[PDB]
Design a protein around this ligand. Structure first.
Ligand SMILES: Cc1cc2nc3c(=O)[nH]c(=O)nc-3n(C[C@H](O)[C@H](O)[C@H](O)COP(=O)(O)O)c2cc1C
Ligand SMILES: Cc1cc2nc3c(=O)[nH]c(=O)nc-3n(C[C@H](O)[C@H](O)[C@H](O)COP(=O)(O)O)c2cc1C
Ligand SMILES: Cc1cc2nc3c(=O)[nH]c(=O)nc-3n(C[C@H](O)[C@H](O)[C@H](O)COP(=O)(O)O)c2cc1C
Ligand SMILES: Cc1cc2nc3c(=O)[nH]c(=O)nc-3n(C[C@H](O)[C@H](O)[C@H](O)COP(=O)(O)O)c2cc1C
Ligand code: DMA
Ligand code: DMA
Ligand code: DMA
Ligand code: DMA
Ligand SMILES: [Mg+2]
Ligand SMILES: [Mg+2]
Ligand SMILES: [Mg+2]
Ligand SMILES: [Mg+2]
Lengths: 364, 364, 364, 364
């Protein structure tokens, strides 16, 4: 019933009120400057971009979500087969459960069966690095789905409020991670889980050789909220404490700036409450290399394959519309299109010593 | 039934909820400084100003709206005959439909019949320049109403979400436009359609010899909203994507600043959600040479001639009041009266590198 | 029935919704810094201050309001006899009506009968200076109540929307005013009427020898609103235009700054929506020499003598509390106590080039 | 029935609507930067800190509240015995009543009986120093509970609106306080009472040798509100005046900055509307040495011992969570962890000349 937590996560995320609960992406404060004369035609817009060694159709990825059981695997199947069809990369949920129990291995292995060509991304938790995971468990997760990269997740917020949570993040784990990167065939992405990557955390990770980040800021799926609900449900007293932390974290937009600024040469996924292609566009324009999505993908896949195919169409169209309307012929042009940064995001950046002049240069 | 789109545009704009829907002019953030001692009498205020080669009574124009059918032409008739009476210039709707079908030619030609002296402004769409329009179609549109100028419209936003939309804006079209200006007897205005002119777009247009701009920013008629409604109505899936773009664009006030700043010597109409003579006053004060109106004129003309005559009286009075209360004896004095720029418009201008010092100089 | 407008003004102001209607003082944005150790006792706080040649008990005045009829004069009687008792100066309403009709002379003359010692301030409208008033009409108004000063009022906003309004403010009127000051035995105050004095207006007035100003900014009695109501009532079409100007003007707080800054050595009444002793305190602290009130005094006087005596007690106490809690032993100490300027007032001051450094110096 | 005021204070504070009534801590504007990789384990977080000569378990204190009667003493008993159990320091309510009546001495003396080891802090009012309290009354208060320090309270705000209030704060009282510190065996803390310490007040107190401050800013228990309620209840006319001052004071967060900045080397309690361990965390991070609480401790103690034990667990956990999620191994690390200062708090600090650069340095 670490597999029970797995179904509870999906069940709450999908059907309960946790999307952006008391949180904010700050994407509100980002405005793409409209170009009344785009200088391009809609049909010649090229959404292709690179994702490590492969090429992907759209600068969007599905980030890690689930696995560890049947109904969980058949979700992963729906996601993967559609992701394949659209040429967009897919992460899988934490593979811990598949390392601990061989029955859960199938619900992850299905992904590569049904999606042979797209980038697939493994997933293990940072806490497990403190609790005696090493080179072989990583290679396990990797070869189990023939992953093109592995995502190690940061979730100290969640672990703290989780009823069975493991809030251990000793510096030792980074020495280990860095050694494991020596021996690994594929690159590592470090990703948060709804609470965002600060420039301190980015710089630290970078100092240990981490080059790929996934922001996962607040404003999307509220993981403190999900554990709060699990806490309420067990009459665990932590529930009320969690309530005080519902807006803890770096908002996604702020995280994107923070990471891009503190480690310019990084490969950067901008995720955490990306809900439309416009949001994807803003995130990329703001500094991300690719935009990441979880929850809305889950909600669609639960409704069935074509429901999700319609979702990706809507996202892709939206993105292309933002590109069109900024005169951005391809992903590179979008990355350097004109933006306005307003309100709280501005105040944030200024206080954190993010120089708006030198920032415009770093993003391009 | 490109004529059907023409009636549907009028029918939605006039009777459905699209005026400023999730959009904003930012005119809110503009404050005309009250002068307790004006230094003038109300009766000596002179609202006269030049409009290319003619002189107009008020620094206000009715911008292009409709034509292509009977009930559409009898609207144009009401507008034009009232515009004439008040000595205010009038643009007509897109003349594409009249180029394609000779029956629609009457609904445009009526305008010059009933309004012999005021500036009348022709209208063709930018996409048509990529789709084989040229010198002769322009001269057609012009001589068809004995136009004093022709407005070429930017509507990539609209075209994108339009169900039958043509979102093609290749750079070629500007090379063509620039050549057509060589041969044309009247000047060209480039205008947007509810989404605004950025300083990048202004500068580009200017580099092709365009000197007359009509901002048409967001915060008035929401053209994305109108197409969304047409999409909902056809059960076209684009409807929901459109919903995400309802606040896409440059707000009018911001656009005025952007144009005036990036191309100081421009002749500049400030339009997009101008609803009162106070709005007109702000737009002029802010940097516009003349203020532009569409939707409220439509709504009045639909109610009848005198309903619209009362409207122009209200607008004029309001304008004169703002002039009086700023001690502005004439349109020139208004253009350099004292203002305050606040809130989001300030943040916008700062981020976009609009120097408030050097701006005050350019508008004065 | 210029006497009828007099009754209607009181009747609307007193019983209808016009106090701060869509307007704002910006006093919100002014904060008096609390001193946990004041350094004084409440009982030793000295509220005394000078008012031209006289001394007054409190740095507060009742500004001009009414007269011209019986029920209007018996209001002036209640106000005056209470003002006398409290040693606070009182302005009277416009004396135009008393110049035009000798029956109205009594409703003004009563004031000096019942208030022999306090400063009484005469009142005439600026428009009348263009319409043939001069030295003798001024001396009339003065000697009619043995005034210690005369207030000439600026009301171009009001006159514009007034149904029988006279919006004439030629520069000639200042040449005349300046000559009339030559021959007058008492000083002149120029005051606005709900719409505030800008720094341009202040400077202009100053260049004609005017040294005493009464801000009367927006956020209090909305005089555009009052005339709008009169308009609605006569089915006058101006009603709707007025509605668009409901928030026209300089907010009181801004006006105080603007005047103090542009003419440092001025004697300055801060009025326009002063509703509590805290408001009075903020206004003085901000830069006013004395605080001015109209509407709330009217409303109390209408309820009877003791109702108004209780009002002045409440005001005085409130003021003293603010003085106590800022460690301000007397009016001078309050004028230089510590403040915070926030929000929109700050943005206003910055845009209008009011240097916050050099401002803090000027207000001391 | 100065003991009646004691019962009324508790009875209103506890059961009526006065917590943060029209007031604000500004803690909203303080954001602790989330660290996705903390670099520590939750279990190795050390919350210990020094409190004068003693060491305390948590950087939190219960600030002074009550005493003077039986049901008041049995509250003090519950608080103290729990405070003891958790190793957190406790202040007692004003000991005036125990100096005046020997029956009230028991309700204070109980505290040291049931809490032998924790720091206990005496309490006397600043007004009593002008009304002939001296060395011996201080030593009385101290030895009556074997206090480790004495808090003298600033409450001019309260005294002003109190029906039986004594608003006397002559400078003389500081000369006296300073002399009394000569002869006293324990240190003196100066604390406010819901209205905050300004940098002027801090500097003044410091110039008289005061080194320990307790901010007690607005946004928590509204003492003006409490006296307002007492006023309403006695039909005292001051009630309405009080209403106008409900948001008078320095917001806690602002006060913390102001004190830390004006007197860097101070020992500083940050109190006034601290309601969660997150609030405690923010206050310490911001500049406080320890966080202070009153009202929520009262409310729990009223419900019984274990209700309050649960409360302290909740607070401690919350605090440790904030520490964890900022990678703060101990109280010192938290004091120098990364923050963002936004909105009104930023505007406040800027206007008050608090240099954000030189501030970041002072807080570490
Ligand atoms: C049901 C669900 C389970 C998830 N589980 C995982 C996990 O196993 N590992 C992980 O790194 N991310 C996990 N995520 C977090 C996402 O990858 C993502 O970083 C975060 O939810 C923010 O994106 P969103 O707001 O678009 O969902 C999960 C999200 C959802 C909705
Ligand atoms: C019913 C209607 C039809 C319009 N059609 C056209 C068009 O043919 N060509 C064009 O350049 N502008 C067109 N406009 C846009 C206006 O000229 C104007 O730029 C825009 O609506 C913003 O102004 P408003 O908010 O005052 O309406 C149309 C507006 C309306 C309301
Ligand atoms: C009923 C009434 C009549 C007034 N008439 C006059 C007038 O005769 N002359 C004048 O200078 N001010 C006049 N005032 C304006 C006030 O002196 C004051 O400047 C303005 O009302 C703002 O103050 P308040 O908001 O505290 O009323 C009048 C105000 C009221 C309420
Ligand atoms: C019932 C009650 C009585 C209090 N009485 C005292 C007092 O005797 N002396 C004092 O210095 N502080 C007194 N306080 C004020 C607190 O010590 C504290 O400074 C203030 O309430 C702000 O903290 P809070 O918002 O956490 O309650 C009292 C607070 C409460 C709730
Ligand atoms: C958002 C996120 C990281 C979800 C997985 O949490 P978990 O603690 O259930 O993962 P694991 O199975 O690694 O404990
Ligand atoms: C606001 C605006 C430009 C309306 C005309 O759009 P359209 O696409 O119907 O014009 P055309 O007839 O040129 O296609
Ligand atoms: C607020 C104010 C100035 C009221 C008097 O206006 P008015 O135009 O009735 O005065 P007058 O009697 O001078 O015309
Ligand atoms: C918040 C606070 C200081 C409460 C005690 O006030 P009080 O005036 O009842 O105290 P004392 O007993 O010293 O008069
Ligand atoms: Mg886990
Ligand atoms: Mg078109
Ligand atoms: Mg008049
Ligand atoms: Mg007391």
């Amino acid at each position: 019933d670490i597999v029970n937590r797995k179904v509870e996560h999906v069940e709450i995320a999908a059907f309960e009120n946790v999307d952006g609960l008391s949180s904010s992406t700050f994407l509100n404060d980002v405005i793409l400057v409209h170009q009344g004369f785009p200088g391009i035609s809609f049909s010649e817009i090229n959404t292709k971009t690179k994702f490590f060694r492969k090429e992907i159709s759209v600068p969007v990825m599905v980030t890690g979500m689930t696995g560890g059981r049947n109904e969980l695997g058949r979700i992963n199947k729906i996601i993967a087969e559609v992701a394949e069809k659209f040429g967009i990369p897919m992460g899988v949920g934490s593979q811990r459960v598949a390392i601990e129990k061989a029955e859960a291995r199938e619900s992850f292995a299905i992904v590569r069966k049904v999606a042979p060509t797209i980038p697939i991304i493994a997933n293990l938790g940072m806490p497990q690095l403190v609790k005696g995971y090493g080179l072989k468990e990583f290679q396990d997760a990797i070869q189990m789905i023939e992953a093109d990269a592995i995502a190690v997740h940061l979730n100290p917020a969640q672990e703290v409020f989780q009823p069975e949570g493991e809030p251990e993040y000793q510096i030792y784990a980074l020495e280990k991670l860095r050694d494991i990167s020596k021996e690994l065939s594929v690159p590592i992405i470090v990703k948060e889980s709804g609470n965002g990557i600060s420039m301190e955390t980015a710089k630290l990770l970078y100092s240990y050789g981490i080059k790929n980040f996934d922001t996962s800021g607040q404003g999307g799926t509220n993981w403190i909220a999900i554990e709060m609900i699990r806490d309420i449900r067990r009459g665990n007293w932590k529930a009320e404490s969690a309530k005080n932390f519902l807006d803890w974290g770096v908002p996604t937009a702020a995280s994107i700036m923070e990471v891009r600024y503190s480690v310019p040469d990084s490969f950067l996924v901008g995720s955490g409450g990306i809900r439309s292609g416009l949001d994807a566009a803003k995130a990329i324009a703001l500094g991300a290399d690719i935009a990441g999505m979880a929850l809305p993908v889950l909600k669609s896949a639960i409704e069935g394959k074509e429901s999700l195919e319609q979702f990706f169409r809507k996202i892709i169209f939206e993105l292309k519309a933002a590109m069109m309307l900024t005169g951005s012929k391809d992903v590179d042009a979008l990355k350097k299109t004109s933006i306005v940064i307003l309100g709280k995001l501005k105040e944030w950046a200024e206080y954190r010593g993010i120089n708006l002049s030198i920032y415009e240069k770093v993003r391009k």
